[PDB]
Design a protein around this ligand. Structure first.
Ligand SMILES: [Zn+2]
Ligand SMILES: [Zn+2]
Ligand SMILES: [Zn+2]
Ligand SMILES: [Zn+2]
Lengths: 316, 318
């Protein structure tokens, strides 16, 4: 009955309403510490994140999963400061996203396994903060290196029970390619969330993965307007999977952040202008939309509370 | 002026002494030493190895090294400061961009990169107050579009601060020529620029032409000869050749060594240490005596190892 957060271990009952795919800052390893003035200042980024997380908490959120890896510039000290000041649980990540530096991309499957295990079992850097989830990312056709990452993630998950979350580049469906590799390693689908699955209308693809026991990440809902399908279209994929009997396979989030340096310079302003609700978009907009579409409150509670707790609880 | 910034603060020109102008404590990636120190055994083991290695170089006459590790090479200025203090060897730290920029760097404009370089030179690196004393840049081939931005940002930061620029030249086809054309288009004096890894080629007429234009010529990978069948002596004879051409004042010599490396295959450090057990002491223990045996006088060797680095490192607007 324990999940590791940036403030230490918590019990399952304390997790509450969870956003399973979020970020405080999307960056690169070392970048926030080397050039904080890219974000105005570290202090300004903290203040923005604390204000935003407090608004999410007032809307009912109790935990977020920050799926920033080392190569996404995860700064666990930043996460800890924001978590404590907003009084919202934050689960930190290990793994490898789409921008590994040489010191990561030259590593073998065995070495990557050891790195993920260090971050889960011992702690991140010198902080003692342990990761509670393993993040992986692929580009449509899984590359040799990305296959090594997925295998190491499966091996680390089998050793520790922590789950795996995935990202696929270019709005492409990658769940079937990912699931093949995970299953060749003996990983249970119930440990894996196929992220950004709301980027497709292919309900056959979604239902087939859910039927195998994968978690389906419908987690970019407010990104609809940026680059196009409406956010309501994406949200109705939640209803569609409920209607086919797969409510227990659904995880919902925003994939939001309070700063971003890994893309074009004022991309944060673009995102904020399109979705001023930020991480509160799920509770303030999506949940009432599903209720008015007739989904029972208990089912919505199961998706936002029970499913994330079952996913995060380490299970061997 | 009279002062150069090191990881222990400012020093005067007269304190710089015998300098290795292209070295590394550790070749890594941003954040990596902090996230996975056990790759190197431990942080403590890496420190102990680096302190021993720098004390050995000091006993061979070295007084300063320039650590040309950028952000994206995993530069850890706290590691540099610790090693510098324990070995009593001055270390000059770098800003700039090498060949592995992450997205947060490679998505930036020339103006943004200029501001990043300026913050590392004028304000400090991270939250340490340690200021960079050189700007490092790297190119491949004919210079890629992103690399050209970096070179232009480096020229702008040099022009605003007086600190010099040192380059990693990859490729065998006279890559210094396109670097020079970019630097000159920005208004940068060649005397602020070291075209590095120039010993990778035997093309003496190319090196002489750059030296005659006022560029410093970095003959700085001498011990990498054996790991391409040129020996280290053949590389070292380029030093003699440029002296005989009349360009002693344009030469900078170094090892391009390190005490840990994670940016290539796992135990590459063991391969390197087996080929060159002298480490950073290879230049003073092997190259300087070799040149003396070939008849280069003491005063000329001191000009290359002491005078030229001081003139290069001294911030000169001009
Ligand atoms: Zn993602
Ligand atoms: Zn994300
Ligand atoms: Zn180099
Ligand atoms: Zn180098």
């Amino acid at each position: 009955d324990r999940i590791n957060t940036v403030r230490g271990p918590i019990t399952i009952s304390e997790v509450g309403f969870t956003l399973t795919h979020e970020h405080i800052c999307g960056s690169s390893a070392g970048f926030l510490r080397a050039w904080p003035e890219f974000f105005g200042s570290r202090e300004a980024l903290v203040e923005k994140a604390v204000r935003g997380l407090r608004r999410a908490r007032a809307a009912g959120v109790r935990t977020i999963v920050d799926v920033s890896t080392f190569d996404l510039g995860r700064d666990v000290r930043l996460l800890a400061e924001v978590s404590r000041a907003a009084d919202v649980h934050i689960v930190a990540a290990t793994g490898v996203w789409l921008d590994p530096p040489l010191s990561i991309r030259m590593r073998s499957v065995e070495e990557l396994t050891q790195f993920f295990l260090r971050e889960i079992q011992y702690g991140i850097e010198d902080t003692g903060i342990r990761a509670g989830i393993i993040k992986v990312a692929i580009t449509g056709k899984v590359t040799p290196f990305q296959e090594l990452v997925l295998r190491a993630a499966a091996r680390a998950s089998l050793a520790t029970g922590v789950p795996v979350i995935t990202h696929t580049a270019g709005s492409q469906r990658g769940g079937e390619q990912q699931a093949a590799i995970f299953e060749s390693e003996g990983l249970s689908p119930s440990r894996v969330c196929i992220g950004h699955s709301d980027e497709t209308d292919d309900l056959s693809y979604l239902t087939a993965l859910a039927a195998r026991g994968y978690l389906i990440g419908l987690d970019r809902i407010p990104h609809s307007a940026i680059g196009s399908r409406s956010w309501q279209t994406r949200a109705l994929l939640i209803k569609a999977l409920i209607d086919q009997g797969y409510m227990k396979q659904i995880l919902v989030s925003n994939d939001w952040l309070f700063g971003i340096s890994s893309y074009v310079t004022n991309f944060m302003d673009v995102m904020d202008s399109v979705n001023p609700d930020g991480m509160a978009f799920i509770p303030l907009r999506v949940i009432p939309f599903l209720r008015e579409k007739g989904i029972p409150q208990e089912t919505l509670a199961g998706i936002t509370v029970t499913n994330p707790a079952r996913f995060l609880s380490p299970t061997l």
